[PDB]
């Protein structure tokens, strides 16, 4: 809600390959770099909702975090080369990487991430697949990732904490604002879609959609106490 | 003295703990006498399960008046309780349903109609047998005739195929006056029988001639063509590109399909000359009928456009021009005589290919007896050309679709006796069951499958004809005996009755698509993979279908690699060009190239759409069939 310009700009951004073939093969752009995203809220659903436009008509691939690397001996970039060869044999796909927080949870991360940086640039392969990287804090990445990695476009997602919460909260009350624009510290599409989906199914349960402030603070207390 | 109290207590405890038959006896012997919680319980749930097991045990045991009086007591009692879709569907299995519906359908129209007719129509075509579905059609003709929402009664005319329904809906829909739309799907919904009976009683009077103007080939197309030219804007890079990368005299045939398939721009149609002269004879027929397939309107313009190719110096030009005259129209019937007169040659003449295009095109334009008496020397000629009896059997078959319980007349008896006359060129024994089964179409209780099982049973040729009669004899009902019989005979040694008899899956369970995905792909016979590929069909194309096209797409046999893009582009009308790019990655023979360009251009229970693909099921032959494969009418 409200982030329509950024989602249509990232829509046109991620909708160049596999679509509009009359100019993609005649002009000759073919960028083998992809985009790199991030967000202070994160939670995977905002960035997954920004890069989710590729999932309409395509084959999706998801690799979240380097946890599968740190849970084993120093194998290093061999699994990255396995994803590179299976991505070469599976060119019509999208390489989506999310939650790059290896330091937010040391010298080896810099060298396997430097090898991932060099191999990610496509020094030995032309335009074959799109690579999308996503993290939470942009300050956690090393400065070596600036020139090779971020070459196409980066997004500046602002955290208002008093505008988007008022918009979405106004959408919920459309069917006492400082308590929820001040108490909450993170939002995404899965919250409005979650409590609105189960709110519609519950409205199918009791056949009325009346929402009282005490029942809404109880349903909020369920999610607050759940975490 | 007060024995109903002891009987009510006895049935109350026996119904309280456990019982299957002893519960309704104190009630049928009690003669019950003398909005609350107690009444809603002892009526709703105790009379629901009580009358459910008594009406079930009496419906399955004997086959009185007590069950009728108690069943009507539950009818009115549930009319007071007003809980639908449970007591109704429970009281379906015990006509009783007719007087029940007309006894209940007074106030609730959309609840019982939408809910009861929706879930009871789906469960009625799924599980309920036909002799009760006819009661659904007649009682639904009653309660829907007295109520609103005419188009569902028009569906009752699609299933009943009766003329009193369309007459009553024409005077009741005419008394209260959109118009061109219900004319469009009014002519699309009606079959060959009820539009000729409709056009004969209405061509008799119609009292205003307006539905006569509508129920022709003028008002189903007069809104379409100008709107299809105006509201749609197609680019020319497809006619120029797909019309530019053609060569090898077969990709140019794929370009004859590019010209043939229309549905705005007409540049590739009139792109100079020599496009038909450089092509072959089969491409002369296909390209000669393409100008007829692009002009299904403007009779005055179609005549002055196709007239140039009439009686030309080449035989296939004028024969394909008569085929074009048969494709452009279906209600003009003014081009019959010039082609019909010269047909009597009997050995070898231009009027044999003009018999192909003219009998086929006239079959597309059409219990007609004069054209069949003229087709008597055609069936008696028995020319070596397969397409003579091809378009003849398909012609009379498409004329005889939707008959009243079929017929065993001397038409199909004559083509069966002359079929068994000479057992040569088995393709005749393959395309004659086309017209046979098309004549079998429209039956509800015909024993013609058993009659063919008595007379037709012979060597596996007419046994393949017999199992084709079994294919067209099982359009769909509650007949799970044909599902276990299907699994039983599915393992036959004959490698064609599996293909067709198992190919019937796309027609038998065409409505309930949840059961259509089966383990046919997990087998090892290429023919079975073809049975699944044909079983895909032409529906909305969910992700499971394309999931099957992922494994079925990559195959080495040219019959399946050629057959996969047709169903791939028919089941999906950014998934249009990406699978075609996959075909470009697989291929980059001639047939796969012509068919992949076909899909490149055309990628972007009605008998008219379910008939013209069983002839496409025999594409694994010479290019002679390709001259008739391009003029299919299943394209909307």
Swiss-Prot record, chain A:
Modified sites of kind N6-acetyllysine: 71
Covalent cross-link site, Glycyl lysine isopeptide (Lys-Gly) (interchain with G-Cter in ubiquitin): 50
Membrane topology term: Lipid-anchor
Binding positions for ATP per the UniProt entry: 39-46
Gene Ontology process terms (BP): proteasome-mediated ubiquitin-dependent protein catabolic process
Sorted UniProt keywords: Acetylation, ATP-binding, Cytoplasm, Deafness, Intellectual disability, Isopeptide bond, Lipoprotein, Membrane, Myristate, Nucleotide-binding, Nucleus, Phosphoprotein, Proteasome, Ubl conjugation
GO cellular component: cytosol; membrane; nucleoplasm; nucleus; proteasome accessory complex; proteasome complex; proteasome regulatory particle, base subcomplex
GO function term, MF aspect, one: ATP binding
Compartmental location: Cytoplasm; Nucleus; Membrane
Domain of life where this protein originates: Eukaryota
Keyword presence, ATP-binding: yes
Role according to the record: Component of the 26S proteasome, a multiprotein complex involved in the ATP-dependent degradation of ubiquitinated proteins. This complex plays a key role in the maintenance of protein homeostasis by removing misfolded or damaged proteins, which could impair cellular functions, and by removing proteins whose functions are no longer required. Therefore, the proteasome participates in numerous cellular processes, including cell cycle progression, apoptosis, or DNA damage repair.
Oligomeric form and interacting partners: Component of the 19S proteasome regulatory particle complex. The 26S proteasome consists of a 20S core particle (CP) and two 19S regulatory subunits (RP). The regulatory particle is made of a lid composed of 9 subunits, a base containing 6 ATPases including PSMC1 and few additional components. Interacts with SCA7. Interacts with NGLY1. Interacts with PAAF1.
Family: Belongs to the AAA ATPase family.
Associated disease: Birk-Aharoni syndrome: An autosomal recessive disorder characterized by failure to thrive, severe developmental delay, intellectual disability, spastic tetraplegia with central hypotonia, chorea, hearing loss, micropenis and undescended testes, as well as mild elevation of liver enzymes.
Designated name of the protein: 26S proteasome regulatory subunit 4
Underlying gene: PSMC1
Residues of the full protein shown: 188 to 430 of 440
From Swiss-Prot, chain B:
Modified sites of kind Phosphoserine: 242, 244
PC repeat positions: 286-319, 320-356, 357-388, 391-425, 434-463, 592-604
Free-text tissue specificity from the UniProt record: Found in skeletal muscle, liver, heart, brain, kidney, pancreas, lung and placenta.
Residues modified to N6-acetyllysine: 425
Region of interest: Disordered: 497-519
Basic and acidic residues bias (residue ranges): 497-517
Keywords: Acetylation, Phosphoprotein, Proteasome, Repeat
Bilayer-spanning residue ranges: none
Superkingdom to which the source organism belongs: Eukaryota
One MF term in the entry's GO annotations: enzyme regulator activity
GO cellular component: cytosol; extracellular exosome; extracellular region; ficolin-1-rich granule lumen; membrane; nucleoplasm; nucleus; proteasome accessory complex
Gene Ontology biological process terms, A to Z: proteasome-mediated ubiquitin-dependent protein catabolic process; regulation of protein catabolic process
Family affiliation: Belongs to the proteasome subunit S2 family.
Subunit structure: Component of the 19S proteasome regulatory particle complex. The 26S proteasome consists of a 20S core particle (CP) and two 19S regulatory subunits (RP). The regulatory particle is made of a lid composed of 9 subunits, a base containing 6 ATPases and few additional components including PSMD2. Interacts with RPGRIP1L. Interacts with CRY1 in a KDM8-dependent manner.
Functional note: Component of the 26S proteasome, a multiprotein complex involved in the ATP-dependent degradation of ubiquitinated proteins. This complex plays a key role in the maintenance of protein homeostasis by removing misfolded or damaged proteins, which could impair cellular functions, and by removing proteins whose functions are no longer required. Therefore, the proteasome participates in numerous cellular processes, including cell cycle progression, apoptosis, or DNA damage repair.
Protein name: 26S proteasome non-ATPase regulatory subunit 2
Species of the source: Homo sapiens (Human)
């Amino acid at each position: 809600g409200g982030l329509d310009n950024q989602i249509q700009e990232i829509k046109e951004s991620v909708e160049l390959p596999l679509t509009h073939p009359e100019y993609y093969e005649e002009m000759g752009i073919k960028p083998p770099k992809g985009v790199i995203l991030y967000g202070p809220p994160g939670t995977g659903k905002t960035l997954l909702a920004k890069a989710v436009a590729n999932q309409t008509s395509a084959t999706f691939l998801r690799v979240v975090g380097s946890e599968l690397i740190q849970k084993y001996l120093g194998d290093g970039p061999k699994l990255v080369r396995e994803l590179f060869r299976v991505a070469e044999e599976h060119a019509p796909s999208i390489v989506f990487i999310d939650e790059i927080d290896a330091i937010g949870t040391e010298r080896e991360i810099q060298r396997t991430m430097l090898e991932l940086l060099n191999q990610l640039d496509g020094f030995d392969s032309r335009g074959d697949v799109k690579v999308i990287m996503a993290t939470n804090r942009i300050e956690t990445l090393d400065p070596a990732l600036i020139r090779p990695g971020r070459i196409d476009r980066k997004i500046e997602f602002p955290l208002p904490d008093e505008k988007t919460k008022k918009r979405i909260f106004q959408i919920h009350t459309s069917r006492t604002l400082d308590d929820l624009i001040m108490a909450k510290d993170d939002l995404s599409g899965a919250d409005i879609k979650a409590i609105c989906t189960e709110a519609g199914l519950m409205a199918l349960r009791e056949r009325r959609m009346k929402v009282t402030n005490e029942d809404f603070k109880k349903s909020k207390e369920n999610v607050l106490y759940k975490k | 003295l007060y024995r109903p109290a002891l009987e009510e207590l006895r049935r109350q405890i026996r119904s309280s703990t456990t019982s299957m038959t002893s519960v309704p006896k104190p009630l049928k012997f009690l003669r019950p006498h003398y909005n609350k919680r107690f009444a809603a319980d002892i009526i709703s749930v105790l009379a629901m399960t009580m009358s459910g097991e008594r009406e079930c045990l009496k419906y399955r045991l004997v086959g009185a008046g007590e069950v009728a009086k108690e069943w009507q007591e539950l009818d009115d009692a549930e009319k007071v309780q007003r809980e639908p879709l449970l007591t109704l569907v429970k009281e379906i299995v015990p006509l009783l349903m007719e007087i029940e519906q007309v006894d209940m359908l007074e106030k609730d129209i959309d609840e019982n109609a939408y809910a009861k007719v929706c879930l009871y129509l789906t469960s009625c075509v799924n599980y309920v047998p036909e002799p009760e579905n006819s009661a659904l059609l007649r009682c639904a003709l009653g309660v829907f005739r007295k109520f609103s929402r005419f188009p569902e009664a028009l569906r009752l005319a699609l299933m009943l195929n009766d003329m009193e329904l369309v007459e009553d809906i024409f005077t009741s829909c005419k008394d209260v006056v959109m118009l061109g739309r219900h004319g469009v799907f009014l002519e699309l919904s009606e079959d060959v029988e009820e539009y000729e009976d409709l056009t004969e009683i209405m061509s008799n009077v119609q009292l205003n001639s307006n539905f006569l103007a509508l129920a022709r080939e003028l008002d189903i197309m007069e809104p379409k063509v100008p709107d299809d030219i105006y509201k749609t804007h197609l680019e020319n890079n497809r006619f120029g590109g797909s019309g530019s990368q053609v060569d090898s005299a077969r990709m140019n045939l794929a370009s004859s399909f590019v010209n043939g398939f229309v549905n705005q721009d007409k540049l590739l149609t009139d792109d100079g000359n020599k496009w038909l002269y450089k092509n072959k004879d089969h491409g002369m027929l296909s390209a000669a009928a393409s100008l007829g397939m692009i002009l299904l309107w403007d009779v005055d313009g179609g005549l002055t456009q196709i007239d140039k190719y009439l009686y030309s110096s080449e035989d296939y030009i004028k024969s394909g021009a008569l085929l074009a005259c048969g494709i452009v129209n279906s209600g003009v019937r003014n081009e019959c005589d010039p082609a019909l007169a010269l047909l009597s040659d009997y050995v070898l003449h231009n009027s044999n290919t003009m018999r192909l295009g003219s009998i086929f095109g006239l079959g597309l334009a059409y219990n007609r007896e004069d054209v069949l008496t003229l087709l008597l020397p055609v069936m008696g000629d028995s020319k070596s050309s397969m397409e003579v009896a091809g378009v003849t059997a398909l012609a009379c078959g498409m004329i005889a679709v939707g008959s009243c319980n079929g017929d065993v007349t001397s038409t199909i008896l004559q083509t069966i006796m002359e079929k068994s006359e000479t057992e040569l060129k088995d393709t005749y024994a393959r395309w004659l069951p086309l017209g046979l089964g098309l004549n079998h179409l429209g039956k509800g209780e015909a024993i013609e499958a058993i009659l063919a099982a008595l007379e037709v049973v012979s060597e596996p040729f007419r046994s393949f004809a017999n199992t084709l009669v079994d294919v067209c004899a099982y359009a769909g009902s509650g007949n799970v005996l044909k599902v276990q019989q299907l699994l039983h005979i599915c393992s036959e040694h004959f490698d064609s009755k599996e293909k067709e008899e198992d190919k019937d899956k796309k027609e038998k369970k065409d409505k309930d698509k949840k059961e259509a995905p089966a383990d046919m792909g997990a087998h090892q016979g290429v023919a079975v993979l073809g049975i699944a590929l044909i079983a895909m069909g032409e529906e909305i194309g969910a992700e499971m279908a394309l999931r099957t096209f992922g494994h079925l797409l990559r195959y080495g046999e040219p019959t399946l690699r050629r057959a996969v893009p047709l169903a791939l582009a028919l089941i999906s009308v950014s998934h249009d060009a990406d699978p075609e790019v996959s075909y470009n990655s697989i291929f980059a023979a001639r047939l796969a190239a012509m068919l992949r360009q076909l899909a490149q251009y055309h990628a972007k229970k009605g008998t008219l759409t379910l008939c013209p693909y069983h002839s496409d099921r025999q594409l694994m032959s010479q290019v002679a069939v390709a001259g008739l494969l391009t003029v299919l009418v299943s394209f909307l």
